[PDB]
């Protein structure tokens, strides 16, 4: 060992000198080892201990040079010396590879654990000698440099990477990386970001804070990749999120309301992106959104006032504007989340069915009525022919509104009645719109309801074909079925008597066995009155025709009543229209009052449309149809109760109510007192009875 130790030490000193290394010297140094080792009982000869002693004092001498350096110099010193030591230790391990082959491996096999390979020995000696004193200073230098980088200045990224790599490699794994660097790094992150957020929120607005936080998070994510280990992604991400977003959730919630007050789509999207990172943090935002939409809807409806009660268009347009605005907000800022669309739906379903208009009408059924009137106004002939593109979108939006209405039966009844009136009188703006509306109602409503509408259109077609065919045999006549159309049923003037018989004979001849009941309250036409001092014309109803044709002077109401056999209640109403048109002279009327004709009537244009609807007809119609709906509701409730009892013999009261509501949910929301009253009636009808004992339980009785 002594014969080769001096030259071996001289050679090893050359390796650690970090200079040009002769290849011949390498093989000579390797040759020394073979002679030293070769001569169980393996020949160790404490060469391992000798090289351990050699490596010990060298690192102490190296540490003497750099023990007093400041923050800036220690990084460069540690990086350079660590790189040189790693390279030289690799070379030395290459030189002494023979020992690791046999004797190092035998020592581990024998069970002794106080040993390591030459490279591992060099690393452990480094950790024990140089790392222990300088670790705190190096870590503090790295932290100061990182803090300098965070403030805007540019730093040398190569210094930190070497320190991180040296810390990672010394774990002989990341046992030493976390204990000496990562904990201090995370504590410094806490200390820096808490103060940064507190100072930033005090001066700058909350809106820019979201951008600042997202930029800081992206910067951290990039920085860890650039000059840190890849095992701290989740740790740093969650710690930074907790520091930045979680602590200020209260001010975030307070801001959200203001950002709702004035539309800021990008800001709301940024807040949603930031809060989504924290688990279980979006619920309160959903509650605020629901409440805000509800309050906005009621505020918008209240603004219109008493005019909206009789104006369907403004009411529907207000509802649609609110819905469109908040749907755009949900679909753009909140990225079509299920919770937010649910919040929109819940708020809409509440402010549509209950608002100021319904309170005035004292019933919740006014909204479907207004919707039906708006659709009918859209689909009538007006002074302006609608565009195809705009009408379809409005019909789509109306169908969107119809989904939130709990009382759909009122809408169905009103729409069917108005469509029947439009079809009879031939006043439809466009047929394609009607076809599209029926196609939509087919998907949105039941099958029994749509068959009624299809029957009306089939009747209209077969009647137009009949009229076209009969024109060749020879004034328009419409023949309708007795069940499909919702119309409920006078002396025919001699002026049109011939046409009556002419049409009746043809109808009887073409088809027999049918009785034709003639309706004169739905018949229109035009007048030719010679006894008017002018050559003019006036569109009028059949009742108005008979009233005008009779005077061709002054007559008593009783005389006219005898002449036309018209009931006085409707006679006064039809006469008031003529008086309101300034075509008669005597608001009140008397049975014996005399009515004359104002000769030389002056009008802006000859063509005057005196077929104005009566003052009370609309109100009477609304009350009648509301009473009819109320009457029809009871039958459905009774049928549902009977059919649910028929299959389940014994059932409880609460379960009964819950099942009836889900049975009738697609038409209306039943009231509990009505259901209780219907059950009481069914009991009196001996359809079911209550079992003795076990109160609040019903059983089916045959």
């Amino acid at each position: 060992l002594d014969q080769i130790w001096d030259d071996l030490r001289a050679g090893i000193q050359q390796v650690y000198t970090r200079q040009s290394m002769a290849k011949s010297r390498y093989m000579e140094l390797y040759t020394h080892v073979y002679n030293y080792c070769t001569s169980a009982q393996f020949v160790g000869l404490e060469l391992y201990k000798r090289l351990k002693e050699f490596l010990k004092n060298y690192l102490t001498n190296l540490l003497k040079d750099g023990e007093d350096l400041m923050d800036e110099s220690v990084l460069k010193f540690y990086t350079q010396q660590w790189e040189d030591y790693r390279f030289s230790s690799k070379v030395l391990n290459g030189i002494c590879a023979y020992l690791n082959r046999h004797w190092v491996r035998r020592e581990c096999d024998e069970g002794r654990k106080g040993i390591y390979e030459i490279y591992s020995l060099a690393l452990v000696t480094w950790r024990d000698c140089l790392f222990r004193p300088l670790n705190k200073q190096v870590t503090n230098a790295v932290l100061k440099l990182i803090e300098k980088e965070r403030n805007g200045e540019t730093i040398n990224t190569r210094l930190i990477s070497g320190v991180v790599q040296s810390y990672v490699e010394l774990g002989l794994t990341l046992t030493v990386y976390k204990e000496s660097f990562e904990s201090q790094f995370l504590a410094d992150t806490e200390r820096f970001y808490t103060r940064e957020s507190t100072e930033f929120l005090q001066q700058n607005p909350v809106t820019e804070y979201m951008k600042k936080a997202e930029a800081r998070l992206l910067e951290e994510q990039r920085r860890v990749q650039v000059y840190l280990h890849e095992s701290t992604q989740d740790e740093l991400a969650r710690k930074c999120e907790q520091v930045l977003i979680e602590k200020h959730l209260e001010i975030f919630h307070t801001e959200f309301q203001n950002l709702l007050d004035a539309d800021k789509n990008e800001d709301l999207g940024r807040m949603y992106n930031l809060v989504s990172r924290i688990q279980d943090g979006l619920g309160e935002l959903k509650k605020l959104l629901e409440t805000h939409i509800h309050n906005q809807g009621l505020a918008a409806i209240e603004k219109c006032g008493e005019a909206a009660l009789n104006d369907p268009k403004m009411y529907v347009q207000t509802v649609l504007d609110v819905h469109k605005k908040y749907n755009a907000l949900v679909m753009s800022a909140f990225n079509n989340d299920a919770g937010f669309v649910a919040a929109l739906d819940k708020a809409c379903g509440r402010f549509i069915n209950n608002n100021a208009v319904t309170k005035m009408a004292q019933s919740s059924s006014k909204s479907p009525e207004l919707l039906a009137r708006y659709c009918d106004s859209l689909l009538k002939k007006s002074s302006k022919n609608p565009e195809e593109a705009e009408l379809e979108d409005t019909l789509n939006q109306v169908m969107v509104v119809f989904k939130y209405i709990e009382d759909k039966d009122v809408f169905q009844k009103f729409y069917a009645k108005m469509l029947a009136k439009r079809l009879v009188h031939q006043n439809s703006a466009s047929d394609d719109a009607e076809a599209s509306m029926i196609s939509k109602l087919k998907q949105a409503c039941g099958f029994e309801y749509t068959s009624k509408l299809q029957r009306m259109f089939q009747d209209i077609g077969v009647s137009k074909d009949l009229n076209e065919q009969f024109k060749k045999h020879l004034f328009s006549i419409q023949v309708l079925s007795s069940g499909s159309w919702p119309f409920q049923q006078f002396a025919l003037p001699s002026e049109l008597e011939r046409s009556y018989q002419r049409f009746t004979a043809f109808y009887a001849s073409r088809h027999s066995g049918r009785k034709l009941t003639w309706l004169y309250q739905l018949s229109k036409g035009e007048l030719v009155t010679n006894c008017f001092k002018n050559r003019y014309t006036l569109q009028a109803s059949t009742f108005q025709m008979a009233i005008l044709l009779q005077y061709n002077d002054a007559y008593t109401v009783q005389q006219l009543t005898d002449s036309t056999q018209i009931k006085m209640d409707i006679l006064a109403q039809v006469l008031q229209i003529l008086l309101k048109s300034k075509l008669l002279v005597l608001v009140e009327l008397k049975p014996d009052t005399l009515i004359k004709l104002y000769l030389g009537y002056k009008n802006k244009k000859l063509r005057v449309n005196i077929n104005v609807p009566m003052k009370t007809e609309q109100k009477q119609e609304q009350e009648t149809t509301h009473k009819n709906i109320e009457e029809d509701r009871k039958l459905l409730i009774q049928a549902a109760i009977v059919r649910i009892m028929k299959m389940r013999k014994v059932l409880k009261h609460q379960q009964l109510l819950g099942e009836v509501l889900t049975q009738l949910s697609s038409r209306f929301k039943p009231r509990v007192p009505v259901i209780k009253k219907c059950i009481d009636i069914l009991i009196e009808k001996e359809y079911l009875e209550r079992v003795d004992g076990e109160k609040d339980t019903y059983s089916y009785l045959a």
Binding site: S476, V479, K515, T517, W518, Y520
Partner: peptide, 11 residues
């Protein structure tokens, strides 16, 4: 002049 009328037919 021109007259438009409506009627219902039943068996």
């Amino acid at each position: 002049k021109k007259w438009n009328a409506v009627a219902l037919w039943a068996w």
